[PDB]
Amino acid sequence: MKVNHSISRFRPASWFEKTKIIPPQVYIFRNLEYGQVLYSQFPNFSQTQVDKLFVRPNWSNRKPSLRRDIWKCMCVVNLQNYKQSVHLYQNLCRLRYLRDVAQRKESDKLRKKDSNGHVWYSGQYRPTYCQEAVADLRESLLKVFENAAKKPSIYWEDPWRMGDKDKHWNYDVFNALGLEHKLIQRVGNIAREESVILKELAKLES
């Protein structure tokens, strides 16, 4: 039998070039249950990806369930090259690690706290994690473009999810690139026919 799929490993640029399943892009997934975010190189994901990201879980940041319904696509970010997309993905993973393990106290300080000193929640949904992921995405992209034709773009689930187009998202580097903040077309069941929509998006920029 064949055990591994495309998702089963980390895939570098060379592998993507060989295959060309999807264009150069990174997918981001909200967790409807907890508000946690999940980055991935592909429009699907497995337990391996979850394990990779959610390495130090606690009561506040519990390791999420892999149940398909609670995961929903926050953001699909397209880039100029496969290698660039891979680098972005690595940066996001690094940032996550820093927030969870290495520079955790700083991250905690940055967050919104409620009375009784806990990171603000409603149920087990914590809206800070999503915000951090957007901020982290912005950071990683910026780093990628510092390190550094198709105009790159970030297809959003929802236009509301931007902090502010003035305060953030108006760096000089992004402007030079032509970073188009588009949104995914909601002319159908967005949750149920999500995979189809993602495929259609992938087709569009190729």
Partner: protein, 156 residues
């Protein structure tokens, strides 16, 4: 020619384009529906592009979508269903215990956003002013649960 999910998506798009139903309409024609729905305030976990309703306990997901389309003109693209638990309640320990009602709450996703109007001030609206009923409740608690020398104890 094409897969099932893709076909469904295409159908939905076609229905949207038409201004007809974005979904296959059923044959069981209910002319005079008696079902009401309670539009709820949004939780932190939801977006501005979602709206949640208390619906009938015998209300279907498809039925709800149909209701939203024909009664109101709103098209819910995705719908989830959250049937709540019924916790035990009793008037007092002398009475028999029974469960509170299992209540069905359906979230919908919609193509245009919505945010509720801001709740009124205590001085503005007569009804939306929780001070009075809460005070009354407190007074009742005091008076029934007052036993001996707490009758002399001044009221809160």
């Amino acid at each position: 020619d094409i897969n099932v999910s893709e076909k469904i998506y295409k159908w939905t798009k076609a229905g949207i384009e038409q201004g007809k139903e974005h979904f296959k309409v059923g044959g069981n024609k209910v002319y005079f529906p008696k079902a009401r729905i309670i539009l709820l305030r949004p939780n932190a976990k939801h977006t501005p592009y979602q709206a949640k309703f208390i619906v009938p306990k015998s209300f279907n997901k498809l039925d709800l979508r149909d209701y939203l389309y024909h009664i109101y003109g709103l098209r819910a693209m995705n719908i989830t269903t959250q049937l709540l638990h019924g916790k035990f309640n009793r008037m007092n320990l002398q009475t028999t215990r029974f469960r509170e009602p299992q209540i069905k709450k359906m979230t919908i996703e919609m193509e245009e956003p919505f945010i509720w109007p801001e709740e009124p001030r205590p001085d503005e609206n007569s009804f939306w002013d929780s001070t009075t009923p809460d005070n009354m409740e407190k007074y009742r608690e005091e008076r029934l649960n007052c036993l001996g020398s707490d009758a002399n104890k001044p009221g809160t």
